[PDB]
From a paper:
A second variant of [name], truncated at Gly411 ([name]ΔC6), containing the core peptide, is catalytically active with methylation of up to seven residues. Isolation and purification of [name]ΔC6 after a short (2 hours) induction in E. coli yielded a less extensively methylated form (predominantly triply methylated). The location of the cofactor relative to the protein is identical in both the [name]ΔC18 and [name]ΔC6 complexes. The substrate peptide sits in the extended active-site tunnel with the amide nitrogen of Ile410 (we define the amide in this location as “i” hereafter) pointing toward the methyl group of SAM; the N(amide)-C(SAM)-S angle is 171°, close to the 180° required for an SN2 attack. The Ψ angle between residues i and i+1 is 0°. Consequently, the amide nitrogen atoms are arranged cis to each other, and the main chain twists 90°. Using structural superposition, we noted that placing (in silico) the larger SAM molecule into the SAH complex places the methyl group approximately 2.5 Å from substrate amide nitrogen. This clash is likely the reason why we have been unable to obtain fully occupied SAM complexes with active proteins. Although close contacts have been observed between SAM and its substrate in a number of structures, [name] appears to have the shortest distance.
Residue numbers in the entry:
A (entry chain B): 7 to 379, 406 to 411
B (entry chain A): 7 to 268, 277 to 380, 404 to 411
Amino acid sequence: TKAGSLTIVGTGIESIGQMTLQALSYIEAAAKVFYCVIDPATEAFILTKNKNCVDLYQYYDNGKSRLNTYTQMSELMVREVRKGLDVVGVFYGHPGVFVNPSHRALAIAKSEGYRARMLPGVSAEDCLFADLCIDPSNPGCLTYEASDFLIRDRPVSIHSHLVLFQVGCVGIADFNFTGFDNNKFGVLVDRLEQEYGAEHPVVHYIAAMMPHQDPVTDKYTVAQLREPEIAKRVGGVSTFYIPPKARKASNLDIIRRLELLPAGQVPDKKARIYPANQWEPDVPEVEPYRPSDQAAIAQLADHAPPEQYQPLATSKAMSDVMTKLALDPKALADYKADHRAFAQSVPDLTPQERAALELGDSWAIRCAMKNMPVIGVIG
Amino acid sequence: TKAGSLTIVGTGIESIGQMTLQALSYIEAAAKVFYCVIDPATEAFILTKNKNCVDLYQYYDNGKSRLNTYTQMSELMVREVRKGLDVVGVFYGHPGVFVNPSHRALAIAKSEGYRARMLPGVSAEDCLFADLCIDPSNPGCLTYEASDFLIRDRPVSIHSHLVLFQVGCVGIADFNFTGFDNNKFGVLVDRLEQEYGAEHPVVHYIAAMMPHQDPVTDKYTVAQLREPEIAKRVGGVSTFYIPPKARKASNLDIIRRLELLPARIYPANQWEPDVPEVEPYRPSDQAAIAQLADHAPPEQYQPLATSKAMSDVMTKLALDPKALADYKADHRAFAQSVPDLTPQERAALELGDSWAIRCAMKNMPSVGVIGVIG
Ligand SMILES: C[S@@+](CC[C@H](N)C(=O)[O-])C[C@H]1O[C@@H](n2cnc3c(N)ncnc32)[C@H](O)[C@@H]1O
Ligand SMILES: C[S@@+](CC[C@H](N)C(=O)[O-])C[C@H]1O[C@@H](n2cnc3c(N)ncnc32)[C@H](O)[C@@H]1O
Ligand SMILES: [Mg+2]
Ligand SMILES: [Mg+2]
């Protein structure tokens, strides 16, 4: 085994609360930490959990290309990996969603034979779905970088959700500590008018960064984005959400191939899943209590568990070790190095529990933890 | 005006580790918990954190429409809200990403006048970006439900990433405890052949659910998906990633209006067909690295300058839901009861404005919110 590793983790968007349990445990275990976050409470919190940190944010500067900064950020991390150290990089949100230097550093580490992994986090788009009360499933979601959207003439879909990141720095390749002069913003507004029309809604979204703050969820017309006092509200942490303009027709040939309806029958056009998208222009709210809904609610009074339902029935020893593998990176490493020896080290496991842990297979652990007489489709 | 609330939270995809600190703290503080997760170690963990939990998974059944189950799930949660209680619903991953009952329950609670909020979590798409080593920024990302993709003829874009959820149950409305007979999967494969070609890559992705497991990241051709032994590997936790065919050329009219020049970023997408190796250390990269020797902190860079007392209270507001509720009820009273704050710190907390808290915690030299790493 070659010494040295790079694990890159996120902190989420809202200070501290949106960090994952595994991001925290890897930060605490690291030999060195490199971080890039944009609120002071999160920075202070990281500095309590590890005493060998470097702030990557100081490698930005007024008038400096962001590409130069990114090469510097990545080289600082890989230099320490090359000394045989367990290094952790930290980026706000999800560390691989609209983040350049993380992909670069991990690809270099991997090419040179070091252990390299990214742990996912909660992005600004994850926050958007939660705060605007939409699901990417209905009716699909397109996500772009705003400048790229324009330069490569990326296609819109007026029947699906559209999300645009980096709307506060259209055509801007450098940095300033105070803020951007977003004077090419009109080029974006022109594209939106062309595709959606002057009166279609655009939602200006800023997720709350502090736990007591409310999110910004302000609706404007495409035309209203040319007013100055409205335009200056769009900054470095602004994202746009553009809702669908219309509903796309169903394909009858596909409906028959999928056997969803027989030949001769057409879908119910006036049918929608509750609730309606609140941001769409002139769309009425759907009824939550149709007769079929009301009948399902009646069945609750009766209801008991089905015969094939598998209730949880585990032990303290088993639950404890499974929790430990998720929260203690050193215990995980030991388990992976030798399943059998780790399994024999754990007190109080039953023969079936010890064997299931010895194997490590998903089927085995489920048999050991559930009363028997992988399907999670909630979509 | 009215007692009772609903907060919906997620657990992430990989057992326990991918839960957020705030999802955990709201689960602990709740009067009643309702959960729907799909591995036993996460279920066991939830049950150690609150004494009053109900498993929503028992409302599925063989040959029963998933729609009927979703209506029952939402009504059970809102019933406890109507009793004036603080209720938490828990769904695996992000609780609003391809999840029907969460949106339903939140919309009903809001319309009736109760407090209602969703806290975001780590989705299967978040895991996909991390494990396949791709960024939705480059070159854009389209995300669809596989059956909806077919039924409403949703457009493909051959120059952007494509992600498809629910590929294991094409055209299937009901539930079965054993698994799906995914016998309409061929209709999906036909659309992908029409749009991308028989030899184009499709990556079959399953994120690790247990902390010791490896992800499934198996690359097939579209044509290979017709083979019975390959098709039957696609199940209830399977997602597809389809990479771009090629790179789209820049538009000169727009380049002129943005005032740019009339150069691929490292690293290249490993999944895209016939993409060459990009050099990590070009001349410009080598010169950026040389500058690290003499580098010092910029003049307008604002180093953190805070106190133990101020850091502690900001951490407390993020990790203690009842402390947050107390502060939001009365900023003055809360700030007065925090020991050892400076006058500037106490006044900043009383205001609660972002500008005030940032001034209190940083040195401002001779005010920005600017995090563009994309
Ligand atoms: C360099 S990127 C980093 C994104 C981050 N890694 C994430 O996971 O969301 C910066 C862009 O993220 C989005 N963003 C960051 N903070 C946000 C917030 N609080 N609310 C809404 N969008 C935000 C904006 O579009 C911004 O221009
Ligand atoms: C009902 S949805 C729930 C999604 C969940 N809320 C999330 O945040 O990802 C079920 C679909 O999620 C995706 N999914 C769930 N678990 C997964 C895993 N471990 N790896 C890849 N995709 C997964 C699959 O597309 C699956 O058919
Ligand atoms: Mg990534
Ligand atoms: Mg949502």
